[PDB]
Amino acid sequence: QQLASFLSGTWQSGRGRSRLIHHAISGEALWEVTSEGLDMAAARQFAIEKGAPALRAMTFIERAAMLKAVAKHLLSEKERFYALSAQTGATRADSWVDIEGGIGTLFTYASLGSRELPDDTLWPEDELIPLSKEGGFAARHLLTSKSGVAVHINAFNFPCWGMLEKLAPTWLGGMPAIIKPATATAQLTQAMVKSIVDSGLVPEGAISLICGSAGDLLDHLDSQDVVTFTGSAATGQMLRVQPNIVAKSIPFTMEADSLNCCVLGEDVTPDQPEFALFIREVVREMTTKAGQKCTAIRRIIVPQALVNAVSDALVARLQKVVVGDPAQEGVKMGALVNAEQRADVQEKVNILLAAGCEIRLGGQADLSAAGAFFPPTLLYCPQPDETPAVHATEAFGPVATLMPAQNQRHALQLACAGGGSLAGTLVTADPQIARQFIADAARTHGRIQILNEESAKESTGHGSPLPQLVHGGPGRAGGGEELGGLRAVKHYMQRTAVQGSPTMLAAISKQWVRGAKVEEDRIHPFRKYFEELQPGDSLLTPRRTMTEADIVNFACLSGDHFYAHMDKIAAAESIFGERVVHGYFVLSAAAGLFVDAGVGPVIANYGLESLRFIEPVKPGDTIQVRLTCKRKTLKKQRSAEEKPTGVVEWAVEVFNQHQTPVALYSILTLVARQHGDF
Amino acid sequence: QQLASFLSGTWQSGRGRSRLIHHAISGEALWEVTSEGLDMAAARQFAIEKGAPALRAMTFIERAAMLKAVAKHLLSEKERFYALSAQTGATRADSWVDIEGGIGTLFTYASLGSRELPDDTLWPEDELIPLSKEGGFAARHLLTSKSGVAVHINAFNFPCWGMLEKLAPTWLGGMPAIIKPATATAQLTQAMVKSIVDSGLVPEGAISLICGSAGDLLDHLDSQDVVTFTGSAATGQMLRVQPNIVAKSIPFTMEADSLNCCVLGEDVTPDQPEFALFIREVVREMTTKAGQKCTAIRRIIVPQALVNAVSDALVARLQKVVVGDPAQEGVKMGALVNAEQRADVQEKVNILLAAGCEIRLGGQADLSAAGAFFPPTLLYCPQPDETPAVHATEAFGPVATLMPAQNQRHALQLACAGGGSLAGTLVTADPQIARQFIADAARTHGRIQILNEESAKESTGHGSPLPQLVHGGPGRAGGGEELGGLRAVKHYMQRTAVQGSPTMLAAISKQWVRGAKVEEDRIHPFRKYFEELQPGDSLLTPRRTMTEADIVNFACLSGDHFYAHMDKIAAAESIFGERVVHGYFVLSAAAGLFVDAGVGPVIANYGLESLRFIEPVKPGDTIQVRLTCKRKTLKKQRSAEEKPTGVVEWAVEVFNQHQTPVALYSILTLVARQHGDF
Amino acid sequence: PGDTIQVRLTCKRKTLKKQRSAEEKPTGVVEWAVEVFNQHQTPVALYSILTLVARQHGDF
């Protein structure tokens, strides 16, 4: 039953030297995997000629909606994925984290995209940068999709999460994806790819899959493609010096093995809740998915005095973990994915012992049984700062090393001796200890959690990467960065500075910018439905002369009697030199000048975005407002009942009688549409 | 006279095989350069043991002040720099570009840093991310300095701008720098390093200088270091696969040779001003410092019909450029820097001719003269889309190739045929043309300018990278990114997600976050001076019950009679279902509840940052405000006269009587300090 | 109009009130001196206000 790979739009396989996928529990070879003789160049050309322009023609909103649809469809069919995940040696909870976290990543990126990306195919990322004095020359930065294909080489740990956490920003960025899973678990990736393809929800050529070897696919890439790698450091570093990849300046992100730490702060005593949650945390991160997560804890750093009590508690809670076939009731920790991984973990443990580690629990595994089971293992390092192997060697399984520290600073040095890690944890109740730990050791960790009693009730965990937070680390951890919210979307896009006149920048951005041409229409802009509005639709209001009576009435009604408005003596000694009008009254009176009173398309206001008070307004000044439609963003109907709306941002400029701007800001509104999209 | 290297705090030189620095005009060898036998490992250790912690102890405000002081001291002594620049073959305007642009980059980064970086040693880049339902578990992203040293390997084009361009963000990020200029022009870099060092304005070990070869410096770097390279693509791609750099995941960004284009829009005709400014632009970019800038125009793409007119105009304007010794009155364009560079330019021109290019203006130089002069060379390519060498070969001199296009889209394809460029220019007057060009060709360009009549008045240029805009490009341009404002500062820092309870995150951040512990005083916070204020100092105000009278009075005073407030019939079928209170009146009444009236340390309000209206406020509801000090930022006294103030951001939270929030926002404020720092 | 006023509020006289029972809250009577000045610091109004003020400790 050879495993097919989906490329050039067809399901096909290869012929030659194979590899086998065994059952992690029984040991039977239940899949054969090979991709020899497949035209890799044809697959790349297929993804580029028809997948990429199809994705790029969609606006960001349409791509986010497509992410959401795909997530829903994948969620409806999760039972198939659970049944396949059972073959890899996972309990129901590990398959849960993998499956449900991958789909939840899709949902999170869909939400972020809908909420904060433009309704366009281009993405203007910052505000307009003025580069002159009369305003004829300005700049802003834009992001456009790269035109190539994204190749994601994933590791066996998370066959579904590891694919979707990369796939979601790849599509949100507008790029097709060629996915190459790890051979040892490709059967679970294939089924999810087949589900996505058979849903009909994504464009043709937007997703390809290589089961087996990539062949010479990297030799055919050019500078508009991107490559991401997850796995062993040797394979990644070999890929990093790929002659084609270095000749074309192809972006390459690497995520290697890291030695994640968990530190116990000096301030805690064994009679505190922090001690118990620390023990529970170390055990959970040691034992979930048999400790095969990239973020699983590998080094435990405790104060010298606490070592014996900590070791007693760890072995006590850790002996109560039953390893076996999760289909049996009473099993809490399954097996490694194959006997090869078991041999690798055993030889790493043997290296650590040969380099000066004592067994506290279960160092040797049954290296002959059918299932790839490993017993939970807790090691001890007595000379932590002169045993350099414990800071470089990572057994990729339920194995962790306890080690002592001193004076709360030796612990920081030991945490940094890892050489760059993905995740670290500090259990403490003292906020100053946590400040010191961050300021000293954040530079070697990609993610750090301070774990006290309050955070422990809803904390997601030491080993769980959330889609909103970056996932990566320096040095030993590869150097790359994933999952930083929209930070990940930007890795599939080119950033470009665009210089020119404001009017040109407005036309290019499809958003109005300061100083650009406007259009006046003799119909108030608040009477136009969403579709009739264009950026640059502008209204000059009538004037209102400020008076002393306005200062008095506003101070009274609001209750703000700040001396700058109500005290002549104190105002004379201020920077302005006399009494001025309240800034909030300038804001309110401006709204009074431009707001259309009667029922119309404008539904809500709900938001003001960047208000600066530039010049003071005095009694005797006359103010006037220009209201320009700045940006529009359609909102997708989440049902057939909801009335179709869109978001409109408006630029507001308040001028005095010298045409001098005295206030600048944006308002957000909800505006109704004439045509919904169900 | 041998050029010294400043490493380990001492001025020293090397002994062995040397390179010679010849005068570009006369040809005399006036410097000898070698660094053999210098302890590079000692230099790096000197940078990281005393330069790096010294820079890291400074807040971003102090490092910005140090940048400004260094820029001033450099500007005062610019005559020496101009004199050493004369030796390189530069007219007064080219040296002005280099010297004043480098110093202006320092000034700009000082300004950006003092204006928008925290008064701390850590940089919290984003707002708090809630990760729980009850608010016990959240996260935000921090940036902290890396521990290592930054090695900047610079090119000969811009010996002053090329160093300070990288040095400003390196220091602002808290990293020591080791500068390695190009040997051919290291005399100008040495003098600027001498100025900086004998100024006494920077910490010890914050800048080192290697004149000549780098020896084995790259072999001794670890994961906390960063490397940058500008120059030849072969040398950079060799550095990219340096075995130590790849084994340790050391960040490495490369900038190489790019074929910058300049398209003429289909809309323009010879009778338009666009045509004249297009000619002027191509000629200025061709002849400024002999066309030796990385952003010089190399490919001119015009419509097939305009080809002969453009070729007449370019030749005419370009014969008027007098090349010679710029010390002679009447010279407009100087020499190249070396006879070696002149030979390289000549052989690139010969390759282009051998690949099918027509001479339009002189293309043969004097390969025996003492000065390294090259005449302005304008080539012609008759069949642009089938001679691939015109899109791959770059003569680093006063050489540019004219080529024809068709149908407005062949020109876009030609622009993209360069394989990734730093800069491109489109001359047009039609904004739709500009939008099409951007949307299709931004992905292969790092910077693009739309050049019309309005922008021509104050346009800084095609070839001048401004410090606010990114400087880089994909593919053939190396793939790197520089100068993007604070974007470049973040390349010398590590980004880290920190999860925990809001109280822990507030301690780590030194800024109050939503949900964190506050502290109340019995003294109103607005009566405290800057130094007495602490993030989290908080005031619960008294309550104000909203009535129908308040709605009527505010609508009357402000003029806003929007139906949701004043029309009970229309409000009946709104989403709220009855009349509500104006959001701006909620804002004003909140200010009335918390603002202290009497003269105190609070000087100005001037700002409101992120206002959302969460829930409607109805008549009969009672509101109460919690005002919390969120973030403090000291402002440096720019004289001894001005009063010392600081910037305080305040968190405002308005609650109704169910303790439900109805408005959240921040106010900015100027607060007087007790003690200035002159 | 154009004059600026400022007030000094001074506690003038305190008089404790005996609790009628063990139930009623213990208050006292405070008379306050009020002095309103204009910007030449000359007084423009003088008067006293009476006030009921809550006590911390009753005497049943």
Residue numbers in the entry:
A (entry chain B), B (entry chain K): 2 to 679
C (entry chain E): 620 to 679
Quote the original article:
In this study, the effect of physical and chemical factors on the orientations of macromolecules was investigated through an analysis of selected well studied macromolecules, and important parameters that determine the behaviour of proteins on cryo-EM grids were revealed. The test proteins used in the analysis include human C-reactive protein (CRP) pentamer, CRP decamer, human erythrocyte catalase, SARS-CoV-2 spike protein, E. coli PaaZ and E. coli β-galactosidase. We performed a comprehensive examination of how macromolecule orientations respond to alterations in physical factors, such as freezing temperature, and chemical factors, such as the addition of surfactants or the presence of affinity tags, during grid freezing for a standard set of proteins. Hence, electrostatic interactions at the AWI are an important factor in determining protein orientations in the absence of any additive.
We previously reported the structure of PaaZ, a bifunctional enzyme from E. coli that catalyzes two steps of the phenylacetic acid degradation (paa) pathway. In an earlier study, when frozen in ice, the enzyme was found to form clumps and aggregates, which was overcome by the use of graphene oxide and a low concentration of protein. PaaZ adopts a preferred side view in the absence of an additive when frozen in ice at 4°C, with a tendency to clump or cluster. However, clumping of the particles was still observed at 20°C. Hence, CTAB was added to the sample and the grids were prepared at 4°C, which led to less clumping and consequently resulted in a high-resolution map at 2.3 Å, as described further in the next section. In the current study, we obtained a high-resolution map using CTAB as an additive during grid preparation, with D3 symmetry and higher order aberration correction during image processing. The resolution estimated by comparison of the half-map FSC (at a 0.143 threshold) is 2.3 Å, and a comparable resolution of 2.4 Å is obtained from comparison of the map-versus-model FSC (at a 0.5 threshold). In the case of PaaZ, the presence of a polyhistidine tag also causes a preference for the view that contains the affinity tag, but this is the side view of the protein, which contributes maximally to the reconstruction, and hence with very little sampling of alternate views the reconstruction is not as anisotropic as in spike.
